[PDB]
């Protein structure tokens, strides 16, 4: 951050923050290009993968900058442009999670994205390490959240949808809808269970059915469904909480 003895000082921390902002702008533009299209091409998936990997590495570098309560680096990030990048990333995450989950070919891209989200939240948690009551960093993070209110609400609703699915799976109605240990159930039985549960509305019910791929005999594999959509949710939601 600062070179005490040198004639001239360069803020590598601020440079890293600026590059992160440029990367998030590029990712947001690429998402806005692919938003209207129904499916993402293989080349687009490779470009997303490389950009997400770069952003993940930048986030890891930033969190290593500030862990070990480095107060100077924490203040530098607080007064830098990190908040705009976080706001853009929140929008991208809140929309791509809905977009990719419906498709069944975007599983690896969804995993890469929702790992980038976790590295994001680790960075944000590290920013609050050594926090004081009524702190400037806390104020600037609450302002960021208020600015990104809608995206945070969308992410929270996604996580809350996919965290109740495990309880619905372990419920007795689902176990009698699958009286055997085979573990495979049709969309009839799964939708009927989700309506007899009364926890999921029609919008959540339709979205959950859409996020489950129909096979040749119209029977889904609920254990892999719940694992795939629960474990990353169980991971990120705890850090958010």
């Amino acid at each position: 951050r600062t070179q005490t003895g040198n004639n001239t000082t360069v803020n590598i921390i601020i440079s890293t923050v600026d590059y992160l902002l440029r990367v998030q702008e590029s990712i947001s533009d690429f998402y806005w290009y692919y938003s209207g299209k129904d499916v993402i091409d293989e080349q687009g998936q490779r470009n997303f993968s490389k950009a997400i990997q770069v952003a993940k590495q930048v986030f890891n570098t930033l969190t290593e900058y500030i862990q070990g309560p480095c107060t100077g680096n924490q203040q530098s990030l607080a007064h830098s442009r990190l908040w705009d990048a976080v706001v853009g990333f929140l929008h991208v995450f809140a929309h791509m999670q809905m977009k990719l989950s419906q498709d069944s070919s975007q599983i690896e891209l969804l995993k890469e994205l929702m790992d980038l989200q976790k590295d994001m939240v680790v960075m944000l948690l590290s920013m609050l390490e050594g926090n004081v009551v009524n702190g400037t960093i806390g104020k600037q993070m609450v302002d960021m959240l208020v600015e990104s209110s809608n995206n945070v609400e969308m992410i929270l609703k996604f996580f809350d949808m996919f965290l109740k699915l495990k309880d619905l799976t372990s419920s007795d109605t689902f176990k009698e809808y699958d009286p055997d240990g085979k573990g495979v159930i049709s969309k009839r039985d799964f939708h009927k269970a989700m309506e007899s549960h009364k926890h999921y509305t029609q919008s959540e019910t339709e979205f959950l059915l859409s996020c489950a791929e129909t096979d040749e005999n119209e029977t889904l594999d609920y254990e892999e469904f719940v694992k795939r959509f629960h474990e990353p949710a169980k991971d990120i939601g705890f850090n958010v909480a």
Binding site: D29, W32, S35, G36
Partner: protein, 35 residues
């Protein structure tokens, strides 16, 4: 409308005020225009 000589000639800002209704990105504007 000139606003430099306000000390002598009062300007008329009632016809100069503008309201910023919408602020969309270029891509989003193109998309809604297409829609």
């Amino acid at each position: 409308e000139s606003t430099s000589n306000s000390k002598n000639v009062p300007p008329d800002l009632s016809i100069c005020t503008f309201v910023l209704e919408q602020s969309l990105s270029v891509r989003a504007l193109q998309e809604m225009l297409a829609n």
